[PDB]
A paper describes a structure:
CDT is a member of the Iota family of protein toxins which also consists of two homologous toxins produced by Clostridium perfringens (the Iota toxin) and Clostridium spiroforme (C. spiroforme Transferase, CST). All three Iota toxin family members are assembled from two polypeptide chains termed the “A” subunit (CDTa, Ia, and CSTa) and “B”, subunit (CDTb, Ib, and CSTb). All three B subunits are presumed to contain five domains that are involved in regulation (D1), oligomerization (D2 and D3), and host recognition (D3’ and D4). Once proteolyzed, the mature form of CDTb forms a large heptameric, soluble structure referred to as the prepore which binds one molecule of CDTa to generate the toxic moiety, CDT.
However, due to significantly lower particle counts for the larger oligomeric intermediates, a decrease in resolution was observed for all intermediate structures containing more than three protomers. A map of the tetrameric intermediate was refined after rebalancing particles to limit issues arising from preferred orientation leading to a map of 7.01 Å resolution. The helical nature of the oligomeric intermediates is also observed in the model of the tetrameric intermediate which illustrates a separation of ~46 Å across the tetramer. When propagated about the asymmetric heptameric structure, this would account for a total separation of ~15 Å in the vertical dimension and ~58 Å in the horizontal direction forming a ‘lock-washer’ like structure and indicating the structural plasticity observed across the oligomerization interface is not restricted to two-dimensional space.
Residue numbers in the entry:
A (entry chain C), B (entry chain D): 218 to 315, 319 to 451, 457 to 748
Write the structure that this text describes.
């Protein structure tokens, strides 16, 4: 009844109970939990509960732009777009006009690679820290170009460059937007960076863009030929970066400064998008929220949900856990003690968690006062960076098992597992996961949980590949998370062997395989 | 109960008790110091207690731009942005369009290098003056560039310049803000000066910037590529500076004028930044305040905090000492007798304090009337220039010990120290601090306090480097601040030794190692 801000949601409703139905506001009482309505909590001191240019009434009543993702309807979640550029095919011709020697390679853009390339894992995890620390944290703007169609052949051989000259470079690209907001007068600047050697800056203008870029699409819309770099001329190169690129290094591509407007609905008619900008509010959004990246094996999200300053009782903003933030940011189906995506079982024991040094130190500090020792029951403070990686394959010996192949001696008939049941061991356990399904010249992590209600009954693992290893593991009365690395190579090799030899007492649960980054092939 | 300004805070509350909670003002009764609420004090003759475009109500209540630092929520702390230019990579090419003979070198920018370059250090500090006098005081507008990748090789050999001609010069720059205020319509002028020969006046324009620069942010936001000078043409140089830059002089780069606006909350919607300027309150803030620079090893701050004219009985403005200004300007945690930043124990005996002639002589004058002989218990004066430099390493035989190398014959089981405990001396005292963790070819100072409850018992010290030195130090009943200079060299040398022989009576405390400025090299 009592109103604070210029939003129709009152002080008693801005916090502690939050529902909008048929363009009026009602409290939350768990009577319409599965009837398409969710509970929120907003700041009661700002109608713009997030850093958004929207009142929390404007953003949660449907009274806003329909191109905005409904994940931004939560008042704590801010509408925030991120545009990057995917790399498709690299063509190298020795002319400045556009004949001559020319090579062409198929390039794949990896977005979340540099964030996760400098990650090195131990065999075991100390304390309740069930995650690892990245060396550096990078957002979803940068892209790393991997050459796939690269047999043993030097790049110099296809161009025949002797002493000082070089060719010219041309590229195939995609212009993706990954955020909870739409984007209109897109003007991105972009650096073509080879380990700091920026070959050129290309700005995408507006003509080769079109005056709309909705979230979740490239400029070449889905299945289409990628846009070449001639529509605004050729990029030069010199013979220092050729053997640099040839041997181990890859070309990188980074969007530097992306400029444009947003749209606001007018009084009478259709939208107007002229007198706005996603430049005057970027820092306002980026300062109040933490930064959370979700990364499946085929797409990614990145969200900014407003958090709390702990050293500020004057700051009266809602406080949520990690899991509450993930549910109200990305959208999650709440099963009993579990969060789900549309299909992926997401948990602190089902995916891979990555934090930079500040976030890792903060959660290491916070885990100690927890009486439960879990990652997700930690309140969010303003301004941390969190990354979530879905593993490539995952089973929990439960409803979810998307494996390429099954094991040997699977005794899942159990109930003292982490999620219900668990897989018993009696003898060996075998998987022969093929060469062609896996991506060449990459790095992969096999992780699992082993529990043993015995004193010193132990297991041995063996990962047989081109870089094979044999390791010894001791489980105990508690559950043990273990991780072991291996490297992929090109597809003309044999299959991939993983063998586990136990002693019939150790129990295995929640086995996952994830990708980390690509090892550079020698060329 | 009496209102004087247009500030809702009354006459009885604009002085002697000052708290904003939930956009109302209450007196200070120290029932609420430890819940994140700081005590302040404002004018009652002017609405804007500082020279900022904010009243004391506007700036201390959250009723202002959220991009402004909360250290500027203190009404005595003025919103004052200082934008400097980081220098990253120096590339020399002999062409005009952008082939030819090129070199590329790694350069590092120091903000406070010229301010602390004229610092001459006494081994024995007279009076309570436990500090030094710099010859010159410079703000955070200038930068000095040191070239790192320097083997023995002249610049002229790599370009082969005989008589009159020369190449052109190209640069990598970043554009940081160091102040308690934001920045929008960035129009800076920056001179590229080589010992008086300004090689260019580079203007950043606005397109290569974007219309925002937050406090504490470069133009390439954190991890990116630095902005280059081809997006606005090449810069020339001539063959009088080629040997000059080669032999002794390094290029400096300083901002002269920066133009641009700030942002105000409108009546209806969002912030507006057209009808503002960071060129009119610059003189209002720079002239009413002292100029206080803080220099960590990894960033720098520069604040202008309003001071008092002591020759003015009608002027009723708040008055603070050095420490009160530091706390209210930077944000500090108060331990028992200690000011803390995030981790650094800051004091008048834990860091280096630097004053130009005006501030240093006024401090020496103020030292006589004080009965405590400490530096921080001096009232601030208008238009004073105070610089604080942290030591690179600092230990006090206490909770704070960040020395990577460790000492010998350390008996910290004592309590007659300056800060609690002290280290007893028996025989030799050794430290082998290696070449890897010290910055090559730069001037460093080993400083400490020696106290001796005996008549003439003394020590000998020895700082062994490429120049080794032995000194004789006599301590007495009081605490003695002593300092010894030394120079680092290239990493192909041996370790750095600091040794001292005592006589079993001398006591040592508060040992620090700081750095003053870089030295030119033979080339
Ligand atoms: Ca309200
Ligand atoms: Ca609100
Ligand atoms: Ca299970
Ligand atoms: Ca007033
Ligand atoms: Ca006032
Ligand atoms: Ca001490």
């Amino acid at each position: 009844d009592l109103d604070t801000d210029n939003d129709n949601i009152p002080d008693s409703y801005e916090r502690n109970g939050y529902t909008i139905k048929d363009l009026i506001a009602v409290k939350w009482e768990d009577s319409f939990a599965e009837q398409g309505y969710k509970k929120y909590v907003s700041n009661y001191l700002e109608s713009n509960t997030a850093g958004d240019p929207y009142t929390d009434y404007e953003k949660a009543s449907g009274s806003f732009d329909k191109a905005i993702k409904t994940e931004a309807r939560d008042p704590l979640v801010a509408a925030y777009p991120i545009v990057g550029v995917g790399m498709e095919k690299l063509i190298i011709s020795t002319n400045e006009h556009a004949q001559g020697k020319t090579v062409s390679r198929a390039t794949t853009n990896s977005k979340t690679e540099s964030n996760t390339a400098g990650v090195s894992v131990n065999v075991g995890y100390q304390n309740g820290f069930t995650a690892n620390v990245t060396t550096n944290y990078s957002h979803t703007t940068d892209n790393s170009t991997a050459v796939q169609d690269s047999n043993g052949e030097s790049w110099n051989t296809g161009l025949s460059i002797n002493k000082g000259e070089s060719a010219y470079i041309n590229a195939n690209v995609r212009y993706y937007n990954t955020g909870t907001a739409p984007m209109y007068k897109v003007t991105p600047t972009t650096n073509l960076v080879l380990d700091g050697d920026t070959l050129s800056t290309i700005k995408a203008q507006e003509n080769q863009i079109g005056n709309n870029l909705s979230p979740g699409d490239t400029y070449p819309k889905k299945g289409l030929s990628p846009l070449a770099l001639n529509t605004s001329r050729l990029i030069p190169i010199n013979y220092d970066q050729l053997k640099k690129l040839d041997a181990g290094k890859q070309i990188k591509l980074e969007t530097t400064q992306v400029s444009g407007n947003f749209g606001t609905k007018n009084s009478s008619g259709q939208i107007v998008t002229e007198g706005n900008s996603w430049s005057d509010y970027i820092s306002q959004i980026d300062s109040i929220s933490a930064s959370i990246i979700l990364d499946t094996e085929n797409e990614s999200y990145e969200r900014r949900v407003t958090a709390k300053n702990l050293q500020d009782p004057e700051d009266k903003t809602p406080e949520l856990t990690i899991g509450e933030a993930i549910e109200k940011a990305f959208g999650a189906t709440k099963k009993d003690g579990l969060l789900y995506f549309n299909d992926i079982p997401i948990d602190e024991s089902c995916v891979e968690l990555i934090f930079d040094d500040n976030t890792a130190n903060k959660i290491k500090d916070s885990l100690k006062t927890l009486s439960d020792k879990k990652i997700y029951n930690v309140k969010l403070e303003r301004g941390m960076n969190i990354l979530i990686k879905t593993p490539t394959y995952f089973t929990n010996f439960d409803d979810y098992n998307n494996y390429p192949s099954t094991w040997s001696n699977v005794n899942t008939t159990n109930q003292d597992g982490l999620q219900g049941s668990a897989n018993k061991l009696n003898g060996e356990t075998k998987i022969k996961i093929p060469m062609s399904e896996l991506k060449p010249y990459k790095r992969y992590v096999f992780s699992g949980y082993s529990k043993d209600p015995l004193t010193s009954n132990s297991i041995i693992v063996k990962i047989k590949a081109k870089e094979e290893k044999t390791d010894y593991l001791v489980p105990e009365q508690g559950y043990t998370k273990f991780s072991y690395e291996f490297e992929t190579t090109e597809k003309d090799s044999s299959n991939i062997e993983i063998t586990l030899i136990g002693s019939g007492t150790t129990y295995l649960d929640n086995l996952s395989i994830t990708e980390l980054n690509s090892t550079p092939e020698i060329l």
